């Protein structure tokens with residue numbers, strides 16, 4: 001059986017590994033291949049800080065809460081392993097800050113030690129009057145992609161750089177299954193009007209003394225459109241931009257100013273930080289993740305497509321649960337083709 | 341009025357600053373001079389991680405509980421100030437780990453969001469069944485010493501490098517008040533059987549992924565004699581060594597192995613960290629801090645001595661309350677000389 005995974009971000013790579021880790025034994029030849037037009041450092045995944053944190057509001061598909069819970073348990077059980085440094089994984093605590101009181105998130109029991117802030121803590125942030133504190137995880141995109149690439153490579157998975165024009169292009173050349181993990185670009189392979197870019201711009205700064213994350217939220221400006229500071233392993237991420245439907249992959253000087261002014265006000269110690277660089281990325285925004293089978297009938301025998309895209313601002317937060325689900329659907333295909 | 345401060349660690353310098361800040365406007369010839377045998381890089385302060393945390397068990401002098409509170413509030417009010425970086429001051433959270441239930445310490449309401457560890461947090465630590473979590477502060481000794489020196493310079497305090505044989509010697513040269521801040525070496529000037537060296541050895545490691553402090557405690561082995569990991573601004577401090585009476589200012593290979601093996605069991609990710617260096621210091625251990633006046637009968641007249649030493653393993657934690665106390669005592673000497 002021939003498998004073609006399109007996409008080399010966290011979704012593409014993690015899905016390919018799961019599939020292989022779960023079916024390499026039971027299957028005759030299991031030939032897996034990855035096609036992507038962009039790799040390891042030029043993907044959306046690369047731009048992400050890698051904070052584990054779902055949206056505050058409840059998901060449209062309750063199944064998404066499980067996928068996140070599963071990703072958190074997976075990562076947590078590997079956090080104190082000697083290899084964690086290479087994945088870019090570690091424990092991190094921090095603030096969520098609000099102007100007004102708001103209900104507890106549904107994930108409050110997934111994170112470590114969830115609590116509300118205390119008056120003395122709130123005094124440090126004059127502009128905010130309510131908030132949370134908890135311990136979570138960071139999975140740094142760049143590093144995790146590299147780790148996944150190495151794991152897959154020693155599993156004899158082959159990588160090809162190419163832009164796919166259509167599913168048929170791939171089916172025509174021999175694929176039995178196609179796993180579609182194309183992110184914000186999925187619309188180019190099949191009409192999906194529900195799918196939109198949530199453009200975001202972030203800054204890398206050098207401020208080793210920052211040990212906590214600080215996320216702020218403001219309903220007037222919307223999700224991830226208010227200042228945030230996220231320490232990485234070497235560098236610190238500064239953000240605050242979420243523009244729906246903007247496809248411009250270019251650092252905008254005015255957005256740069258919004259980041260810098262917003263973050264310095266939150267944390268004045270940043271005034272003396274060193275700016276290492278800036279990048280722009282596209283959040284695959286969709287009312288819910290498209291994780292489903294589609295059979296592509298092409299005359300005699302047809303080929304199987306598994307869609308896995310539309311993880312918006314929570315692809316790292318949820319990837320692993322999604323990969324198991326994709327692996328689960330792949331399994332259904334095997335028994336249908338009678339090969340359990 | 342000629343003042344002589346002996347000692348250029350955290351106690352000497354801070355005390356110097358307060359006295360100068362509090363009385364320069366009400367005294368016409370207020371002359372201050374610091375004498376020290378060792379400066380800014382080679383003091384015990386330089387070797388301290390700079391974590392704010394008192395001893396678990398209550399202080400002998402209850403006044404010490406207050407001096408700690410004052411220091412914490414002082415430092416807290418300065419954390420989000422643009423200059424905090426210079427001082428090496430910042431917020432940090434972390435774990436205190438025990439093998440059994442232990443009572444809440446006095447200082448539970450001083451630190452930010454104190455709470456007990458939850459079962460899931462304890463699962464990350466196999467050898468420990470109880471613990472706390474909270475947010476505290478780091479004052480990097482090396483950096484603060486450097487800051488203090490700059491403040492004193494611009495205020496016109498003069499520094500001299502010389503080892504003082506006796507108070508008598510200093511009184512002879514015309515000093516009206518001697519401020520005695522001589523650390524563990526205080527007994528060389530005046531017999532003090534209660535003061536003993538608490539030798540300590542630390543390791544600087546590069547492990548930027550460490551965002552929390554981890555302190556372990558073992559009742560058998562004693563205070564600061566179990567592994568600990570404390571992230572600094574650029575570097576991570578590994579320790580776990582407290583030996584009473586030992587005067588050897590030399591790194592011990594066995595002590596080294598003890599630090600390293602203990603800290604790797606606790607946090608396996610360190611196995612991959614690169615070692616920068618290693619230093620030894622002496623905690624000025626005393627049943628309680630000596631902070632008091634003593635009239636020294638030297639000739640026809642008599643010179644005032646303010647002692648301020650014996651801060652054990654909480655010199656950084658407590659330095660600011662102490663310095664204000666020493667300034668308070670300085671105020672009395674002034675009313676009595678009729679010059680208030």
Ligand SMILES: Cc1cc2nc3c(=O)[nH]c(=O)nc-3n(C[C@H](O)[C@H](O)[C@H](O)COP(=O)(O)OP(=O)(O)OC[C@H]3O[C@@H](n4cnc5c(N)ncnc54)[C@H](O)[C@@H]3O)c2cc1C
Nearest residue numbers: 007009037038044045050051164183185200281315316317
């Ligand atoms: C600024 C920012 C910060 C973020 N922070 C976080 C965070 O802290 N935590 C979190 O959980 N999530 C975060 N996210 C979201 C997360 O990064 C994304 O949801 C995640 O990267 C999506 O995975 P993926 O599908 O993008 O893989 P992708 O990045 O989409 O991989 C895409 C690959 O597929 C290829 N491709 C696309 N179309 C085709 C085609 N037609 N033919 C061939 N190849 C194609 C591309 O060349 C590319 O190489 C953040 C996003 C942004 C923008």
Ligand SMILES: Cc1cc2nc3c(=O)[nH]c(=O)nc-3n(C[C@H](O)[C@H](O)[C@H](O)COP(=O)(O)OP(=O)(O)OC[C@H]3O[C@@H](n4cnc5c(N)ncnc54)[C@H](O)[C@@H]3O)c2cc1C
Nearest residue numbers: 347349377378384385388390391504523540654655656657
């Ligand atoms: C390994 C380690 C880690 C620590 N970590 C922390 C921590 O995380 N938090 C915390 O609060 N505390 C900590 N401490 C405790 C803290 O470091 C000390 O209590 C503090 O440094 C004491 O200040 P000081 O009196 O030592 O100044 P000192 O370091 O003692 O300065 C003394 C100066 O006086 C001079 N002097 C002495 N005698 C004479 C003389 N006769 N003539 C002339 N000059 C003389 C010396 O040359 C020296 O320069 C730690 C200690 C150690 C050892």
Ligand SMILES: Nc1ccccc1C(=O)O
Nearest residue numbers: 051200224228239313314
């Ligand atoms: N996904 C996120 C998680 C935390 C902070 C920012 C983002 C962001 O997408 O900008």
Ligand SMILES: Nc1ccccc1C(=O)O
Nearest residue numbers: 391540564568579653654
């Ligand atoms: N004063 C301290 C605070 C925290 C951890 C260790 C120490 C120490 O003296 O070794």
